[PDB]
Amino acid sequence: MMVISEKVRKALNDQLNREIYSSYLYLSMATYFDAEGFKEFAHWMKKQAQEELTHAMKFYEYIYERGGRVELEAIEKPPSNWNGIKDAFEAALKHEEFVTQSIYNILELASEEKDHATVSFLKWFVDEQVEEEDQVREILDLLEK
Amino acid sequence: MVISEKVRKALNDQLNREIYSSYLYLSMATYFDAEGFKEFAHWMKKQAQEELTHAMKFYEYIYERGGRVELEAIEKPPSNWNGIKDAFEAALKHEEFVTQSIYNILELASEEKDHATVSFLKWFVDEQVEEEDQVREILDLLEK
Numbered sequence: 186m187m188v189i190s191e192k193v194r195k196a197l198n199d200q201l202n203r204e205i206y207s208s209y210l211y212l213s214m215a216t217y218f219d220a221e222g223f224k225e226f227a228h229w230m231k232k233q234a235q236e237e238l239t240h241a242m243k244f245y246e247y248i249y250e251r252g253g254r255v256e257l258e259a260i261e262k263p264p265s266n267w268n269g270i271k272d273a274f275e276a277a278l279k280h281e282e283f284v285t286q287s288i289y290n291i292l293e294l295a296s297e298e299k300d301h302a303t304v305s306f307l308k309w310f311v312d313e314q315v316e317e318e319d320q321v322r323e324i325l326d327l328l329e330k
Numbered sequence: 331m332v333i334s335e336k337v338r339k340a341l342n343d344q345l346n347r348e349i350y351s352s353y354l355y356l357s358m359a360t361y362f363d364a365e366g367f368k369e370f371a372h373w374m375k376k377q378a379q380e381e382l383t384h385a386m387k388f389y390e391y392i393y394e395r396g397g398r399v400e401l402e403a404i405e406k407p408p409s410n411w412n413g414i415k416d417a418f419e420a421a422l423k424h425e426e427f428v429t430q431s432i433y434n435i436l437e438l439a440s441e442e443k444d445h446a447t448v449s450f451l452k453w454f455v456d457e458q459v460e461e462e463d464q465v466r467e468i469l470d471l472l473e474k
């Protein structure tokens with residue numbers, strides 16, 4: 186019933202678990218901000234946390250509409266503390282660039298397999314990822330002022 | 331054409347709404363730049379660019395479904411607002427109109443069992459919810 190390859194289902198499945206860890210990382214950034222009493226930065230991390238679950242569930246439902254199956258993996262414990270405000274956001278940017286590269290790797294994999302549906306599915310996330318990296322760069326830019 | 335004329339017209343209308351939103355955000359950049367709010371202006375210019383990418387998504391989807399795009403005249407946007415908060419409230423009010431308009435196309439596309447168009451729009455429903463919350467977040471931070 187699967188109209189994607191195993192290599193593609195696997196890579197999509199891996200990304201879903203990365204989106205889940207992303208939500209968890211952002212949640213853990215919330216705990217740091219909130220403990221430092223930066224309640225607005227924390228509110229942004231909790232919103233980002235809920236959005237990354239939106240990302241993960243988008244991968245979920247794509248995997249299944251293409252006849253695949255999802256296996257959830259263990260979620261590593263995220264850091265719960267950073268050396269200041271700028272450093273936590275630098276970590277967010279670092280993580281978002283990591284997510285971007287991983288999505289790029291799936292896109293090239295899907296193109297070499299002539300998988301049009303998965304290429305087209307992924308282009309939506311490339312744009313969101315460009316937006317999400319620029320968001321952090323803007324925050325970092327404004328903090329060094 | 332594998333979309334109905336009703337959906338095509340709805341999608342072409344939204345394309346022109348994205349085109350206008352881009353021009354609105356550019357106009358807001360002219361205001362922020364005039365007033366020295368250079369960083370705000372950069373946000374507007376990036377948003378103007380993004381709204382154009384929204385326009386070209388609808389463009390390509392229409393042609394991919396066998397429809398045609400027709401570009402309408404672009405209204406002159408406001409040039410000036412009464413301060414930063416006023417500029418961002420207008421943005422928020424404009425985003426809410428864009429959100430409603432997309433839902434109306436989603437409603438119509440569902441009723442016609444146009445599955446491809448439902449699936450296309452659900453990306454925009456989610457982007458719209460984020461874009462609304464971004465400017466709402468700005469406004470809350472301005473009350474400060």
Ligand SMILES: [Co+2]
Nearest residue numbers: 224225228470
């Ligand atoms: Co808040």
Ligand SMILES: [Co+2]
Nearest residue numbers: 204207237240
């Ligand atoms: Co994500």
Ligand SMILES: [Co+2]
Nearest residue numbers: 207237281317
């Ligand atoms: Co992200």
Ligand SMILES: [Co+2]
Nearest residue numbers: 313316457460
């Ligand atoms: Co977005």
Ligand SMILES: [Co+2]
Nearest residue numbers: 236313317460
């Ligand atoms: Co986002």
Ligand SMILES: [Co+2]
Nearest residue numbers: 322323326372
């Ligand atoms: Co910038």
Ligand SMILES: [Co+2]
Nearest residue numbers: 326369372373
């Ligand atoms: Co800037």
Ligand SMILES: [Co+2]
Nearest residue numbers: 348351381384
């Ligand atoms: Co738009």
Ligand SMILES: [Co+2]
Nearest residue numbers: 351381425461
């Ligand atoms: Co918009």
Ligand SMILES: [Co+2]
Nearest residue numbers: 316380457461
């Ligand atoms: Co956006």
Ligand SMILES: [Co+2]
Nearest residue numbers: 228466467470
């Ligand atoms: Co808020």
